[PDB]
């Protein structure tokens, strides 16, 4: 009997003579297998259409936004880099800056709007903690911040 | 016209006949046409989505009908005749016969006529 | 243009699909000319064709890197990019005829129709009467937007319709403007540039962008926090990456951060309020490369050197302010000229400032040095 | 096949013949059924049938454009072209039975004849005995040439006679020795293809043309008397500049200069008599690159090197046989990733097989070798 779900439907679409036809059953088992694969492939393409669910297509999104495409890095890290990269195209209001840094890091961030005349404070929070290296966040902040404002950081678990 | 041959399919066994070589047993145009006719009769109409409205018959649906015996006989003649005649090779189908061998269980015959069965006039100027 | 590295399984061969198709069968001839082979081959043909033409093209048009039509325009829209529209060519017709003869705006005057050219028509933009010297200059447009309008001078000597009194008409100037639709190639880069560029406002890149918007500013570099909180510096250079002229600094100063102030116009520069922006020219540290260049046919050494100067000059932009100049990178630029067949066949003995060592800028911008063939 | 123009005379109508025959009569009646009509009409009818059938068929068989059967074969023999002949299906049959049983050569076993299909007869090529093991295998052959036979695995199951002690006869694997008579139109094509006028001596140009005719031969080169005595070397590159595979070499070798000729055989390849030929392919030099690679933060060293390996190999594909490897350009291939920041942070001691200069190939093509990070202490 046909194993493929699509194969069974396609066989039933024909005349009912093929109940005992091993040849026809085997034939549409093969045909159903490919259409099953195409449907799974079709759903896979849908994931590539967005940076959030890009998966193996995330390199395309990294290629699209100019980020250094790299497979060995964590996919979630690549997603966070891409999402932050895309969102950098409007006013650097404290809401937008917070989510961009939050999206890149993945950890909750609160911008303090520091008391000093031309500095802005950043405060980060994560239940799981952080590694000992977070320099690239500061690289982006220096690149992304207004040129006339300094920055301060504190990290909380 | 140039009708083409097709591949045998033993309806008794419900499988294709294949040679010792393993290739499916080809057969003649006329054999293919006979193979086609039995298949079309057994294919209910409007239900098997692969085929259009032309293909298939409706004999199975007639079983549940409330029509009298004689009415059902004519419907059988109409249904079988309509289904077969769609094929180009058909010339005519008819000479239907019926035998209600039991109280309500039927056996019927019909005769098919090919295009090649026609008789040709012999004359030239 | 950029190519999308599609996975292999999304680009299976037809035969590979067909071969996997025939794998299931066990006790039937799967040879060509058989029912199994013949019946299954069209399915493999469609499955492979749908996989390639359907999915890959569908995926390709999704991204701006591989989009061509309205899909590209929509993608360009989402990041604020819009394709430039065509425009009419324009210019002046010097009329000639009896003074007092009336000619109306909108009259159709064309070029000389020929076997290989139709009457390229033009529309008068002004209603005027012939002047004192039996002449009058009337501006006119191209009826067809695009480069067709930009016809040469003297071509428009044809007036359509029965109007007497006018003795002759002519276009003294080859018409200008006449823009056609922006090409896909130009539009794709603009969309790609907008996609990749962060396009913030107030950050150092924007300061560089505003500096480069000023004419004469070849290259610009910005230092945040050069003098603490609120302090910004801008370091500009001419087109040759040399010390920018003071007027250019003044132009960039007025453009981004005027020193003069007014009650209404505090500064009205491109920089935000509260910034303290400084505009200067940096220290131009030249890095003169010297190598035993060997040159190819169909190229001029001086032209090739200038091209290599431009290539390395681009690499200096990649080099950060106060960065490190890489000898290995310069090997890449020099050898790539050879791999591109761009007038260099071989090279050797390359020495940047007569040393095969990477040079570190001391918070300066490297200036483009002289390329020397050894 | 080509249609046959026919002379007008050979296609005369029956009545036209009869009308001409009756033209001279003017005294006696010539009505249908009259005696004069009786005498003349069968002659006219017989002439037309013979003229239209017998003579036109003779004209058809004259030329190879329209000949057929034995007639087309002889026209093949005019220019010395023979059509291929069929062969009998060959294979092995497994036998099971009493060990004392003996099976002789020439025994006949067939397939299962049925109403739909007739049995295919096969003959054993060997004599064996089951004395050691209950199972034995005997080589067999179809008694009829052609693709008839070439049966499936388990088809052979019938013995015409009945051998004592045999428990089961079953073919184990499908037969493969069968092949049919060559197609007439294919053979007619072969007859008409063999019409080359000149360029048949076997010069360097001729050998290059012959090598190029075989598929998969991108380029070919000839060495005259590489081993003396009129010997000819045929150095071949495939479509992608690469060294031709052994199978491609054998095909080109067999096409031009067969080596499997038996005692009662002679070479049919394009190589004329006395011209010794050999097919060769150059040597693929491997470019093992050595350098103290330094990679960027957190990236995969294997990934970056493999990408560099791909980049160099693409460049190496541009090189030809006997070409020059550009070491100085290869520096930038490594340095290309530096500009794009594709992994490589820095490199040093860039060498190609421990060489720092352009290498010139000699009877050699170049392929990508092994990318080795020095990791110098």
TrEMBL record, chain A:
Q: Which source organism does the UniProt entry give?
A: Clostridium phage phiMMP02
The residues of the intact protein that this chain contains are 1 to 157 of 209
Q: What name has this protein been given in UniProt?
A: XkdT-related protein
TrEMBL record, chain B:
Organism superkingdom: Viruses
Q: What is this protein called?
A: XkdS-related protein
Organism equals Clostridium phage phiMMP02
Q: Which residues of the full protein are shown?
A: 24 to 148 of 152
TrEMBL record, chain C:
Which residues are in the Baseplate protein J-like barrel domain?
Answer: 93-178
Q: Which organism is it from?
A: Clostridium phage phiMMP02
Q: Which Pfam families match?
A: Baseplate_J, Baseplate_J_C, Baseplate_J_M
Give the UniProt family note. Answer: Belongs to the Mu gp47/PBSX XkdT family.
Q: Which InterPro entries did the record assign?
A: Barrel_Baseplate_J-like, Baseplate_J-like_C, Baseplate_J_M, Phage_Baseplate_Assmbl_Protein
Domain (Baseplate J-like central): give its ranges. 201-280
What name does the UniProt record give this protein?
Baseplate J family protein
Tell me which residues make up the Baseplate J-like C-terminal domain. 287-366
């Amino acid at each position: 009997m046909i194993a493929s779900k699509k194969g069974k439907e396609m066989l039933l679409t024909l005349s009912p003579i093929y109940e005992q036809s091993i040849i026809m059953q085997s034939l549409y088992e093969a045909i159903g297998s490919e259409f099953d694969n195409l449907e799974l492939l079709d759903e896979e393409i849908e994931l590539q259409l967005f940076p959030q669910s890009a998966t193996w297509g995330l390199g395309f999104w990294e290629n699209r936004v100019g980020l250094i495409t790299n497979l060995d890095e964590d996919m979630e890290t690549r997603r966070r880099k891409v999402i932050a990269k895309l969102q950098s195209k409007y006013i650097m209001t404290p809401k937008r800056m917070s989510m961009i840094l939050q999206s890149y890091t993945g950890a909750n961030i609160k911008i303090n709007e520091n008391i000093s005349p031309y500095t802005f404070g950043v405060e980060l929070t994560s239940t799981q903690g952080f590694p000992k290296d977070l320099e690239d966040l500061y690289k982006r902040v220096n690149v992304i911040k207004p040129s006339h404002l300094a920055v301060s950081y504190k990290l909380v678990s | 016209l140039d009708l083409k041959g097709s591949f045998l399919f033993d309806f008794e066994k419900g499988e294709f006949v294949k040679n010792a070589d393993g290739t499916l047993k080809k057969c003649d145009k006329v054999q293919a046409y006979k193979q086609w006719c039995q298949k079309a009769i057994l294919t209910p109409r409007y239900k098997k989505a692969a085929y259009t409205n032309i293909y298939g018959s409706e004999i199975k649906d007639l079983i549940a009908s409330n029509l009298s015996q004689s009415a059902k006989e004519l419907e059988i003649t109409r249904l079988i005749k309509e289904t077969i005649l769609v094929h180009p090779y058909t010339k005519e189908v008819g000479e239907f016969s019926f035998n209600w061998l039991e109280n309500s269980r039927l056996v019927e015959y019909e005769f098919d006529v090919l295009t090649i069965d026609d008789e040709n006039i012999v004359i030239d100027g | 243009e950029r190519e999308l590295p599609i996975p292999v399984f999304l680009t299976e061969d037809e035969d590979s699909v067909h071969e996997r198709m025939l794998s299931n069968f066990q006790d039937v001839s799967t040879l060509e000319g058989d029912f199994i082979y013949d019946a299954t081959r069209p399915t493999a043909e469609q499955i492979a064709e749908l996989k390639q033409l359907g999915l890959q093209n569908n995926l390709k048009i999704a991204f701006p890197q591989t989009s061509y039509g309205t899909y590209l325009e929509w993608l360009g829209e989402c990041k604020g990019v819009f394709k430039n529209q065509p425009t009419k060519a324009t210019g002046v017709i010097t009329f000639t005829g009896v003074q007092g003869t009336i000619i109306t705006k909108g009259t159709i005057v064309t070029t000389i129709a020929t076997d290989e050219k139709q009457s390229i028509e033009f529309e008068l933009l002004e209603t005027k009467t012939i002047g004192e010297n039996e002449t009058v200059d009337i501006k006119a447009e191209s009826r067809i937007v695009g480069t067709i309008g930009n016809v040469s001078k003297g071509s428009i000597s044809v007036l359509l319709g029965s109007i007497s009194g006018v003795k002759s008409i002519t276009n003294k100037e080859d018409f200008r403007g006449g823009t056609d639709i922006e090409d896909e190639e130009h539009f794709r880069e603009r969309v790609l540039v907008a996609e990749q560029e962060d396009k913030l406002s107030g950050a150092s890149s924007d300061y560089i962008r505003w500096a480069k918007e000023v004419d004469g500013v070849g290259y610009a570099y910005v230092v945040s926090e050069w003098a603490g909180a609120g302090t910004v510096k801008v370091l500009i250079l001419d087109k040759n990456r040399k010390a920018a002229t003071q007027e250019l600094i003044d132009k960039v100063q007025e453009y981004i951060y005027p020193l003069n102030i007014s009650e209404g116009e505090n500064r009205d520069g491109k920089a935000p309020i509260g910034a303290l922006v400084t505009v200067v020219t940096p220290d131009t540290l030249l890095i003169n490369v010297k190598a035993s260049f060997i040159f190819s046919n169909g190229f001029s050494e001086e032209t090739v050197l200038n091209n290599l100067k431009t290539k390395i000059d681009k690499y200096l932009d990649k080099i950060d302010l106060g960065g490190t100049v890489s000898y290995n990178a310069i090997q890449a630029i020099v050898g790539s000229m050879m791999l591109t067949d761009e007038g260099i066949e071989d090279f050797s003995n390359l020495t940047i400032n007569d040393v095969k060592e990477n040079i570190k800028l001391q918070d300066q911008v490297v200036g483009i040095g002289e390329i020397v063939n050894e």
